[PDB]
């Protein structure tokens, strides 16, 4: 009984490994060997966005590529205007502890969450010229870590109870729950077609989920430690993950294979957040060594360093237009690079 | 700039002023982080001074705010890396789970992101420990072989009126904890062991004095003295 099930699982894993080994014919580095390198890119801090009285955990660019919403432990959800460094709104929260933030594609709503296990929704473009709680999404067991909006009424939230969920704003209860993870889920990322999304947990594995079916599709495991953050390739057939192993990993969906390893001998510090570019050539990442590094997605070479922070960086974000980059760190100031 | 831009700048200035006022008001309170395990008197200690639970209290016109979260704390512990102190309670009476308590304390102390957060450590339920020592049913040497060769250090002067074996046991436990703390302390952050019981009411003064010493050390570091 139990022995037969274990043998069947072992055989399934063995045939998965055989299929994985058979699909790997030539390394991506060997194919893109005759590709001109992007060279060294040096980006300076165009404007610093000061005004936070405590450390910062999250940030998300808007669709218009002008508004940032930064989540900080001072109990505020300041909304910054990137062009003029203007604070559009100041949102005091019930709970100071925060590790996630979101911005609606329409720009009308913001979402926040932390150790209170509740995803607060604030409506910006409304009457009485104020930002107020719209829905206090509750029902999670573990701490909330990453939220991303699909529409103005549909959310995907990752919590600390090794599960993800898709919630409906109007209804107020979970539309669908996603379970199967064994480790703490630390991040979440969406896709341009808004049909599939990838999530990273603390069990050294990333997993793809379908918003419609509500069941897992693919599970990739190539990391030795927890995956702190994940970003998804703009094309829609790949993504990138970052762990505490001081290495990033670019996986692809169509092949179900690990493609490249991103690591350097000098760095030992882990990855906090990763982000891609509009074209997808450059893969951004943030490390514990109080700076960021720009790495090429095809060469795995250090293209430049963004050492503008004092403490280790928390979040990195790229605008929809790809014009600029935002890095929010625990130094209480988030910097804009271009 | 346009008139709308100037008005937006004025609004931003007012928002920044409100932010500064709120930050100044919030920074006046001293925040702590309470940790423990099962059969550890977190509830009795926190009620003595009375997803995430929080408490007020005040000592000598100084406000303290306490946070406790209700395994694998390696992730949410990153939130509390700017707090003034981490209180860690341990059940000194129970010997079965004392070793895993030592392991937990070692994981907390050597945590990479608590590299500058001092720890105030509480040996809760001292009367239960004294009763267990008096009974003699449970022996420390059964669990910790080094207790047999251990002796009470000189110049101790614990308190008036406890048996020498009780003092020996309590200082053996305290020496274990202090050795774990000072294995890689390097002087950036130190531990404050204390002997508290379930009925003791002077548990706020100990925390007040320990946090006062922590802030004194921080100020000494700030003036470049150390």
């Amino acid at each position, epitope marked *: 009984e139990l022995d037969q099930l274990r043998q069947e699982a072992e055989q399934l894993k063995n045939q998965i490994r055989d299929a994985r080994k058979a699909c790997a014919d030539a390394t991506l580095s060997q194919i893109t060997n005759n590709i001109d390198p992007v060279g060294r890119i040096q980006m300076r801090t165009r404007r610093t966005l000061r005004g936070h009285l405590a450390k910062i955990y999250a940030m998300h660019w808007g669709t218009d590529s002008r508004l940032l919403v930064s989540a900080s432990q001072d109990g505020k959800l300041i909304i910054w205007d990137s062009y003029t460094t*203007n604070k*559009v709104h100041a949102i005091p929260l019930r709970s100071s502890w925060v590790m996630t933030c979101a911005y609606a594609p329409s720009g009308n709503y913001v979402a926040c969450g932390g150790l209170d296990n509740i995803c607060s929704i604030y409506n910006l473009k409304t009457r009485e*010229g*104020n930002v107020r709680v719209s829905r206090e999404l509750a029902g999670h067991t573990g701490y909330l870590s990453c939220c991303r909006f699909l529409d103005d009424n549909q959310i995907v939230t990752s919590s600390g109870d090794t599960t993800c969920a898709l919630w409906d704003i109007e209804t107020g209860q979970q539309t669908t729950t996603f379970t199967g993870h064994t480790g703490d889920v630390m991040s979440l990322s969406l896709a341009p077609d808004t049909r599939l999304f990838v999530s990273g947990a603390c069990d050294a594995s990333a997993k793809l989920w379908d918003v419609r079916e509500g069941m897992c599709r693919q599970t990739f495991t190539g990391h030795e430690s927890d995956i702190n953050a994940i970003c998804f390739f703009p094309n829609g057939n790949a993504f990138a993950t970052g762990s505490d192993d001081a290495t990033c990993r670019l996986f692809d969906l169509r092949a179900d294979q690990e493609l490249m390893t991103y690591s350097h001998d000098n760095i030992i510090c882990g990855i906090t957040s990763v982000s891609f570019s509009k074209s997808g050539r450059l893969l951004l990442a943030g490390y514990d060594d109080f700076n960021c590094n720009v790495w090429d997605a095809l060469k795995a070479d250090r293209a430049g360093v963004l050492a503008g922070h004092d403490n280790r960086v928390s979040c990195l974000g790229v605008t929809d237009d790809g014009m600029a980059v935002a890095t929010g760190s625990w130094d209480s100031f988030l910097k804009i690079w271009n | 700039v346009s*008139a*709308e*831009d100037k*008005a937006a700048a*004025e609004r931003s200035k*007012m928002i920044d002023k409100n932010l500064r006022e709120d930050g100044e008001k919030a920074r006046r309170t001293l925040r702590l982080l309470l940790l423990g395990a099962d059969n550890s008197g977190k509830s009795t200690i926190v009620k003595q001074m009375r997803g995430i639970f929080e408490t007020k209290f005040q000592v000598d016109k100084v406000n303290f705010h306490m946070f406790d979260v209700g395994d694998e704390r390696r992730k949410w512990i990153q939130c509390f890396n700017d707090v003034t102190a981490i209180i860690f309670v341990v059940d000194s009476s129970d010997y079965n789970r004392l070793q895993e308590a030592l392991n937990d304390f070692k994981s907390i102390w050597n945590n990479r992101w608590l590299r500058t957060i001092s720890v105030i450590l509480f040996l809760n339920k001292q009367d239960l420990l004294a009763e267990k020592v008096l009974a003699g049913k449970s022996k420390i040497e059964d669990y910790f072989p080094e207790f047999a060769r251990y002796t009470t250090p000189e110049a101790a002067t614990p308190e008036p009126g406890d048996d020498p074996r009780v003092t020996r046991a309590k200082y053996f436990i305290r020496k274990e904890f202090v050795d774990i703390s000072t294995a890689s302390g390097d002087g950036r952050h130190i531990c404050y062991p204390h002997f508290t019981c379930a009925v003791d009411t002077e548990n706020a003064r100990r925390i007040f004095n320990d946090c006062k010493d922590i802030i004194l050390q921080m100020n000494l570091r700030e003036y470049n003295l150390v």
Partner: single-chain antibody, 230 residues
């Protein structure tokens, strides 16, 4: 939200009068206040503006030196004090709330106005005064002395519609964005010193007076006004 103003009446020339406007349903402190005048037989003219927290107070050229404005946030009230008034100050007073940030809609709500009877600037031009017209597209053109386009790329002109016998409401701000509650039938475009407002499938309750108002720099100046008739 509600904004109601009280005061006014028959007053001898040269006297001092107080107009008090009270607000409910919204944060008065965040919003900035505007006092504007409507002559009984003429168009709208701006009078005064006060920012959030009374940080900046601006007055019109005509009323400079004899008009004072104040606001009491805890009481959610706005006071206007008038001294040495003239015979030209007899008009209807309108109080307007305006919020100022990126993507905001200034002049979104107009409070109920009062009536007072007494015993350089950018010029707005409206070529059409009365245009006969339901169900037919109507185009209204407004011209400015100088281009209302700043370096940042933001254009500053607002279109206001006046119903017969009550406060105006905003239709189009920045000549492109549509205010909340405005039907999609309204549309706006324009270029340097020439702005156009287009209405398609005109229906009932669209009769009113159209004003084009420039907000690039103070003092605020309103359009002459275009009347639409059946």
């Amino acid at each position: 939200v509600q904004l109601v103003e009280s005061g006014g009446g028959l007053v001898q020339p040269g006297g001092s009068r107080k107009l008090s406007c009270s607000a409910s349903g919204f944060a008065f402190s965040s919003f900035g206040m505007h006092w504007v005048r409507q002559a009984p037989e003429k168009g709208l003219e701006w009078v005064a503006y006060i920012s959030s927290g009374s940080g900046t107070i601006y007055y019109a050229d005509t009323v400079k030196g004899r008009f004072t404005i104040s606001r009491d946030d805890p009481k959610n009230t706005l006071f206007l004090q008038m001294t040495s008034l003239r015979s030209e100050d007899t008009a209807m007073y309108y109080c307007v709330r305006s919020i100022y940030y990126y993507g905001s809609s200034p002049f979104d709500f107009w409070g109920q106005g009062t009536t007072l009877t007494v015993s350089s600037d950018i010029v707005m031009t409206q070529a059409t005064s009365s245009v006969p017209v339901p169900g037919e597209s109507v185009s209204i053109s407004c011209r400015s002395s100088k281009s209302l386009l700043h370096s940042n790329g933001n254009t500053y002109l607002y279109w206001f519609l006046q119903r017969p016998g009550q406060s105006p409401q905003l239709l189009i701000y920045r000549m492109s964005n549509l205010a909340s509650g405005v039907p999609d039938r309204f549309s706006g475009s324009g270029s340097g010193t020439a702005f156009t407002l287009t209405i398609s499938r005109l229906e009932a309750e669209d009769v009113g007076v159209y004003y084009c108002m420039q907000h690039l720099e103070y003092p605020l100046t309103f359009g002459a006004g275009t009347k639409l008739e059946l």
